[PDB]
Amino acid sequence: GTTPGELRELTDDELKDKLRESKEELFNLRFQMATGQLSNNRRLRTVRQEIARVYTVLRERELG
Amino acid sequence: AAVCDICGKGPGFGKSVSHSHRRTSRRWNPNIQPVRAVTRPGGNKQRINACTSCIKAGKVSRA
Amino acid sequence: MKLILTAEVEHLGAAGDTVEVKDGYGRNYLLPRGLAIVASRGAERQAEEIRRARESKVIRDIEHANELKTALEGLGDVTLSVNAAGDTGKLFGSVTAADVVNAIKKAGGPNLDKRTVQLAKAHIKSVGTHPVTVKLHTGVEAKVSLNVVAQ
Amino acid sequence: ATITDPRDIILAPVISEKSYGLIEDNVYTFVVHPDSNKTQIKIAIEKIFDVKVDSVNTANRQGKRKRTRTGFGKRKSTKRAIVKLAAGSKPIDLFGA
RNA sequence: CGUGUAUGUGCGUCCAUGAUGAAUC
RNA sequence: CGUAGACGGUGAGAGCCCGGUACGUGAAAACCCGACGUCUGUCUUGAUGGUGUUCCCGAGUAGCAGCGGGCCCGUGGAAUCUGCUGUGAAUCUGCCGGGACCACCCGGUAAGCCUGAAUACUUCCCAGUGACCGAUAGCGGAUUAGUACCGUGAGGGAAU
RNA sequence: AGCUGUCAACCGAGCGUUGAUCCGAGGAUGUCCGAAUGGGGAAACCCGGCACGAGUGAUGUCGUGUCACCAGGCGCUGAAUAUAUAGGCGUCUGGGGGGAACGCGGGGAAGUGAAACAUCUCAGUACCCGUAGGAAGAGAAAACAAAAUGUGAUUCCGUGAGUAGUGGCGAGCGAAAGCGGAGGAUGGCUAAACCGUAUGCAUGUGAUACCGGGUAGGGGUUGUGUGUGCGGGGUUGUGG
C-alpha cells in the first residue's frame, strides 16, 4: 500500500507525514530486530525502500 | 633577467663549441633591462623587464 | 631618433625644429619631459608641435597666476555639451578633462591644462550642475560650477 | 527535501549484560550514528521517548579485525551512547528487556 | 558559562540634580 | 531434407536435445548523420568588359655582422631555414630564391597577416581471429593480486 | 511461470497478472577524502553570514544551500600628492586536476660504438618541462625546377637510395630533385588618394565653407592637421 502512484497522489505535507511515519516504523523495526523480536526481517527493507520512494517523489516534485 | 615582459622574448639554447669542438649546453639570453616604464602618460612608473629590442622599438615609455 | 622640438633646448635647436638625437636622449629627456614629440606622420606632427608649444605657453600657471585664477574663479556657471540621454542624463560620451578645459575657456578666458581638472572626483555621469575642482597649485583649488547640457 | 528525524541518529539498542545492568539502573545504551554528538543524542532521545535525559555518555568502539582465507576483514566502527535519564523518567521499555 | 524569578536604582532620565572659560574695544 | 553441419553446452564425436547459427524482424526514451522549414550577410541603388598617361599602396622586418642550432652538409667555398646580440633597407626600375655576381634569365611576391577536412595512436566499449600460451606457460596477477609479504620511503613483489 | 549479486550454505519474504529477478535508456539520492576550494589537516576532522525551525520555564544542537585562489562587462571608490593610476569592493563568466597511446613546442643524458678516447656516435634517444586535439602545423607556394607547350593550395606512403654526399673521410651518418600513389580544393583579412562616420591639442576670421561638376545664396555638415575602429573607397604575381 505504498506504491509510487499512491505516493504521487499524496500531497507534499502528506508525503512528509508518511515520511516521518515510515522513519518511526523503521526505528521500531531496528529496535525489534536488535532485541531479536522481529519475525519478518524483510520489513526493514520494505520500509527503507518506502522511505526512498517518498524522498524520490518529493524530489521529483521539487524538480518538476 | 632572461624573459621580456612585453614580447615574451626568452633565452635561446645552443652549444658553446671549444677549439677541440667540445659542445656544451649554453644560453643566449635576451638583453632585457630593468625599465621603469610609464604605461599611461599620467606619470606613475612601474619596474618591468624589457628587452633592448622593445626599448629600441619604443614599446617602453619612460615618460 | 627623428623628433620635432616642442620647446627650446640649449645646444639642440629651436622649438619646432626637426633633429636627429641619440635614442636615449630622445627617450629619457625629450619625450618624457615633453620638450619634443617623435617626428611621426608629418602632416599631423607639424601642427602638433606648434600646438603643444602654444598650449604650454597659454596654459602655464605661475605662482602669482595661481592666486590670480583663484580670484578669477568668481566666474558663474560654465556650460558643457555632452551626448547623453534625455531621461536619466547618462552620458554616452563621458566628460573629459579636455572637454572641461574647452568649456571653461569658451565661457571666460582662464586657459588651463586639462590635468588640473578633478574630473573623476567630480564624477558627473549625469545631466545638470556638477561642481568640479581645478587644482592650480599646491594650495589653490578653485571650484567651477559646470552645468551639463544634453546633445 | 531533507526531513531529518532524531531516529536517524539512534540506530539500535545495545543488548548485553552491561547494557541490561545499566537499564535496571535506568541508563539506556544505544548504537548511535558515528558523526553524532552528546547534545544531539540528548535532543533526539528526549524527542523520541518524551523523557528527560540527565547525561549522555558516548564511546567510539573500533570494529574487530577478523581473519579469513582472503585475509583480514574489519567490522564497522560503532559509537555507543549511554544515556542516564532523570529521576521520574518513564522507563524506555522499547528495548524489550 | 547561560535562562525564568526576587533583593537592592549603587547614578542618570522629557524635567530638576555637579564640573568647565563661553566671549566686545 | 539444410536458403541455416558457425561455435558451444548437454552424462562420450549432436545440423535435427538446449543456447544459438543462416535469417521474419525489433526502440518508448536518450545519443549520433540526412530532406524541408523558421534563423542568419550581401545585390539589382550602373561596377564587371574594353580604353588609356600620371600619383599612392604591409618594418625594428628583410639584409648584413658576431656567436650558435638544424639541414647529406662535423664551419667548410656554405647556400636555403632558424635562436640571441648589434646594425639596419620602399612600394614593383621594389624585394626574395635558383648553394657568389653584370646580369641572358627564370620562379615567387616574406616580413601586418590569419585560417579547412582527408594521416598517427588505443585507457575504454562491441564483435571477432590465431600452424599463440595452457597453470614453473600465458599478463606480475586463471586463485586474497599489485593482494600476502619485504622496505622508512620511492619502490620490489609472489605462491596457490 | 522463477526470485532476493557472489565467494557460499543455512531464517524470513514477498513476484502475476497490483508482470517477477533480470537487461537497456533517462533521471533522483549520491556520506567523507581527493584539483578539494569556508578555515585548518597526520587524504577521510573544526567554522562564518543567510533563511528553517527545535523544544523550549531555556542554552546548546541539527538539516538546507553559500563562503578558496586570475581577467572582463554592469559597475563603485582612486592611496601616497594631482587624485586625471596601483590597489580595494560587488557581480558574472572561466581555470585549477586526472587520463594508456598518439601530436606540437622546448630542455636534454649516459651506459654504449668508435675494440682506448674528447670530435663524432649513442641521440635529439631515455628522461624532463609546457601544451593540446580527437587527431595534431602549414596552408591557398620570398616553392621547385631548368630553358620544357615544365609541375603548381598540404600532409603521409613507395622509390629515388644506403645513392649524391657527409664523416678524428674513423666508427658511422645520410638527403633532396624527380617519378608512382593516398586525399583532393586555391578562403579570408586585406594597406592604398578620399569617406558615413566618436574621441586628442589648436582653432570665431563665427567663410575661403566639407557638399562628391558646374551655381545663385549662405551664416551652415562647425569652418583646418589629425592617431585610433566599425563598414566603404575595395583589393595577386601577367596587382590594386
PDB file of C-alpha atoms (C1' of nucleotides) in Angstrom, chain G residues 73-193:
ATOM      1  C1'   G G  73      31.192  43.706 -18.951  1.00  0.00           C
ATOM      2  C1'   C G  74      27.225  46.379 -15.387  1.00  0.00           C
ATOM      3  C1'   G G  75      29.905  48.742 -12.302  1.00  0.00           C
ATOM      4  C1'   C G  76      31.511  51.688  -7.345  1.00  0.00           C
ATOM      5  C1'   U G  77      35.958  54.080  -4.985  1.00  0.00           C
ATOM      6  C1'   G G  78      41.148  56.331  -6.756  1.00  0.00           C
ATOM      7  C1'   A G  79      46.253  55.898  -1.537  1.00  0.00           C
ATOM      8  C1'   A G  80      50.816  58.041  -1.265  1.00  0.00           C
ATOM      9  C1'   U G  81      50.264  64.456  -3.968  1.00  0.00           C
ATOM     10  C1'   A G  82      47.490  65.818  -8.899  1.00  0.00           C
ATOM     11  C1'   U G  83      43.601  62.467  -7.476  1.00  0.00           C
ATOM     12  C1'   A G  84      43.454  62.665 -14.283  1.00  0.00           C
ATOM     13  C1'   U G  85      46.905  55.365 -11.602  1.00  0.00           C
ATOM     14  C1'   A G  86      48.251  50.808  -8.360  1.00  0.00           C
ATOM     15  C1'   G G  87      45.053  48.810  -5.175  1.00  0.00           C
ATOM     16  C1'   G G  88      40.099  47.987  -2.537  1.00  0.00           C
ATOM     17  C1'   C G  89      34.620  46.372  -3.162  1.00  0.00           C
ATOM     18  C1'   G G  90      30.107  43.927  -5.604  1.00  0.00           C
ATOM     19  C1'   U G  91      28.588  40.817  -9.579  1.00  0.00           C
ATOM     20  C1'   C G  92      29.261  37.360 -13.680  1.00  0.00           C
ATOM     21  C1'   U G  93      31.728  34.061 -16.855  1.00  0.00           C
ATOM     22  C1'   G G  94      36.001  30.769 -16.881  1.00  0.00           C
ATOM     23  C1'   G G  95      40.719  27.995 -14.877  1.00  0.00           C
ATOM     24  C1'   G G  96      42.875  24.636 -11.379  1.00  0.00           C
ATOM     25  C1'   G G  97      43.180  18.240 -11.532  1.00  0.00           C
ATOM     26  C1'   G G  98      43.250  13.240 -13.919  1.00  0.00           C
ATOM     27  C1'   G G  99      43.994  10.254 -18.251  1.00  0.00           C
ATOM     28  C1'   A G 100      47.235   4.269 -21.716  1.00  0.00           C
ATOM     29  C1'   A G 101      48.900   5.657 -26.573  1.00  0.00           C
ATOM     30  C1'   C G 102      49.319   9.306 -30.487  1.00  0.00           C
ATOM     31  C1'   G G 103      50.565  15.385 -31.561  1.00  0.00           C
ATOM     32  C1'   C G 104      53.263  20.165 -31.305  1.00  0.00           C
ATOM     33  C1'   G G 105      56.931  23.249 -28.875  1.00  0.00           C
ATOM     34  C1'   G G 106      61.105  23.404 -25.602  1.00  0.00           C
ATOM     35  C1'   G G 107      65.231  21.329 -22.279  1.00  0.00           C
ATOM     36  C1'   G G 108      68.149  17.244 -22.814  1.00  0.00           C
ATOM     37  C1'   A G 109      71.838  12.438 -20.709  1.00  0.00           C
ATOM     38  C1'   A G 110      74.971   8.439 -20.038  1.00  0.00           C
ATOM     39  C1'   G G 111      75.736   3.388 -20.254  1.00  0.00           C
ATOM     40  C1'   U G 112      77.229   2.267 -25.477  1.00  0.00           C
ATOM     41  C1'   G G 113      80.171   2.224 -30.579  1.00  0.00           C
ATOM     42  C1'   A G 114      84.427   4.296 -32.276  1.00  0.00           C
ATOM     43  C1'   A G 115      87.906  -2.619 -29.959  1.00  0.00           C
ATOM     44  C1'   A G 116      91.239   3.354 -25.869  1.00  0.00           C
ATOM     45  C1'   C G 117      89.127   8.383 -26.127  1.00  0.00           C
ATOM     46  C1'   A G 118      87.494  14.050 -26.300  1.00  0.00           C
ATOM     47  C1'   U G 119      85.069  15.370 -32.445  1.00  0.00           C
ATOM     48  C1'   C G 120      81.574  12.023 -33.686  1.00  0.00           C
ATOM     49  C1'   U G 121      78.135   8.040 -32.134  1.00  0.00           C
ATOM     50  C1'   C G 122      74.719   6.554 -28.650  1.00  0.00           C
ATOM     51  C1'   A G 123      70.725  10.524 -29.939  1.00  0.00           C
ATOM     52  C1'   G G 124      67.661  14.507 -30.308  1.00  0.00           C
ATOM     53  C1'   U G 125      67.149   8.510 -27.856  1.00  0.00           C
ATOM     54  C1'   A G 126      65.822   7.810 -22.265  1.00  0.00           C
ATOM     55  C1'   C G 127      64.090  11.282 -19.082  1.00  0.00           C
ATOM     56  C1'   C G 128      62.078  16.098 -18.070  1.00  0.00           C
ATOM     57  C1'   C G 129      59.096  20.712 -18.921  1.00  0.00           C
ATOM     58  C1'   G G 130      54.697  23.405 -21.339  1.00  0.00           C
ATOM     59  C1'   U G 131      50.507  22.420 -24.032  1.00  0.00           C
ATOM     60  C1'   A G 132      46.652  20.216 -26.528  1.00  0.00           C
ATOM     61  C1'   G G 133      43.029  17.641 -30.193  1.00  0.00           C
ATOM     62  C1'   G G 134      40.281  13.723 -31.495  1.00  0.00           C
ATOM     63  C1'   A G 135      43.699  13.653 -34.150  1.00  0.00           C
ATOM     64  C1'   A G 136      47.669  17.224 -34.055  1.00  0.00           C
ATOM     65  C1'   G G 137      51.235  22.727 -38.165  1.00  0.00           C
ATOM     66  C1'   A G 138      51.257  24.732 -42.674  1.00  0.00           C
ATOM     67  C1'   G G 139      48.191  26.401 -45.969  1.00  0.00           C
ATOM     68  C1'   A G 140      45.879  28.583 -50.977  1.00  0.00           C
ATOM     69  C1'   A G 141      53.743  28.239 -52.687  1.00  0.00           C
ATOM     70  C1'   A G 142      60.247  35.069 -50.967  1.00  0.00           C
ATOM     71  C1'   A G 143      58.020  26.806 -53.900  1.00  0.00           C
ATOM     72  C1'   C G 144      60.523  23.618 -57.051  1.00  0.00           C
ATOM     73  C1'   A G 145      62.642  23.072 -61.489  1.00  0.00           C
ATOM     74  C1'   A G 146      65.814  24.241 -65.808  1.00  0.00           C
ATOM     75  C1'   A G 147      65.385  26.654 -70.721  1.00  0.00           C
ATOM     76  C1'   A G 148      60.113  22.128 -71.076  1.00  0.00           C
ATOM     77  C1'   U G 149      53.607  23.658 -74.707  1.00  0.00           C
ATOM     78  C1'   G G 150      57.548  22.145 -67.249  1.00  0.00           C
ATOM     79  C1'   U G 151      54.809  20.969 -62.068  1.00  0.00           C
ATOM     80  C1'   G G 152      51.631  24.073 -59.289  1.00  0.00           C
ATOM     81  C1'   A G 153      46.793  25.369 -52.464  1.00  0.00           C
ATOM     82  C1'   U G 154      49.285  20.176 -47.839  1.00  0.00           C
ATOM     83  C1'   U G 155      50.358  16.199 -45.305  1.00  0.00           C
ATOM     84  C1'   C G 156      51.540  10.831 -45.442  1.00  0.00           C
ATOM     85  C1'   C G 157      53.250   6.180 -48.236  1.00  0.00           C
ATOM     86  C1'   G G 158      56.841   3.775 -52.061  1.00  0.00           C
ATOM     87  C1'   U G 159      61.017   4.778 -54.721  1.00  0.00           C
ATOM     88  C1'   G G 160      64.998   7.808 -55.919  1.00  0.00           C
ATOM     89  C1'   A G 161      68.966   5.319 -52.155  1.00  0.00           C
ATOM     90  C1'   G G 162      72.105   3.081 -48.480  1.00  0.00           C
ATOM     91  C1'   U G 163      72.804   6.835 -53.763  1.00  0.00           C
ATOM     92  C1'   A G 164      74.578  12.107 -54.154  1.00  0.00           C
ATOM     93  C1'   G G 165      77.133  13.365 -50.399  1.00  0.00           C
ATOM     94  C1'   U G 166      78.746  13.701 -45.318  1.00  0.00           C
ATOM     95  C1'   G G 167      82.436  11.690 -41.697  1.00  0.00           C
ATOM     96  C1'   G G 168      89.034  12.179 -35.973  1.00  0.00           C
ATOM     97  C1'   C G 169      86.635  10.852 -44.600  1.00  0.00           C
ATOM     98  C1'   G G 170      87.312   6.654 -38.325  1.00  0.00           C
ATOM     99  C1'   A G 171      83.044   4.335 -36.084  1.00  0.00           C
ATOM    100  C1'   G G 172      79.446   5.927 -38.700  1.00  0.00           C
ATOM    101  C1'   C G 173      75.912   9.314 -40.604  1.00  0.00           C
ATOM    102  C1'   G G 174      72.923  10.218 -44.955  1.00  0.00           C
ATOM    103  C1'   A G 175      69.340  13.537 -48.362  1.00  0.00           C
ATOM    104  C1'   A G 176      66.768  16.153 -51.826  1.00  0.00           C
ATOM    105  C1'   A G 177      65.077  16.911 -57.042  1.00  0.00           C
ATOM    106  C1'   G G 178      62.376  13.798 -59.977  1.00  0.00           C
ATOM    107  C1'   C G 179      58.791   9.870 -60.506  1.00  0.00           C
ATOM    108  C1'   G G 180      54.386   6.339 -58.715  1.00  0.00           C
ATOM    109  C1'   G G 181      50.410   6.740 -55.111  1.00  0.00           C
ATOM    110  C1'   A G 182      46.663   8.172 -50.513  1.00  0.00           C
ATOM    111  C1'   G G 183      43.335  12.772 -50.408  1.00  0.00           C
ATOM    112  C1'   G G 184      41.697  16.287 -53.028  1.00  0.00           C
ATOM    113  C1'   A G 185      40.328  22.220 -53.070  1.00  0.00           C
ATOM    114  C1'   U G 186      43.079  27.693 -54.415  1.00  0.00           C
ATOM    115  C1'   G G 187      39.334  31.036 -48.142  1.00  0.00           C
ATOM    116  C1'   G G 188      39.505  35.437 -45.651  1.00  0.00           C
ATOM    117  C1'   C G 189      41.930  39.947 -43.884  1.00  0.00           C
ATOM    118  C1'   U G 190      43.329  42.897 -46.741  1.00  0.00           C
ATOM    119  C1'   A G 191      47.337  48.585 -46.646  1.00  0.00           C
ATOM    120  C1'   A G 192      46.455  52.461 -50.536  1.00  0.00           C
ATOM    121  C1'   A G 193      44.192  59.453 -52.799  1.00  0.00           C
TER     122        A G 193
END
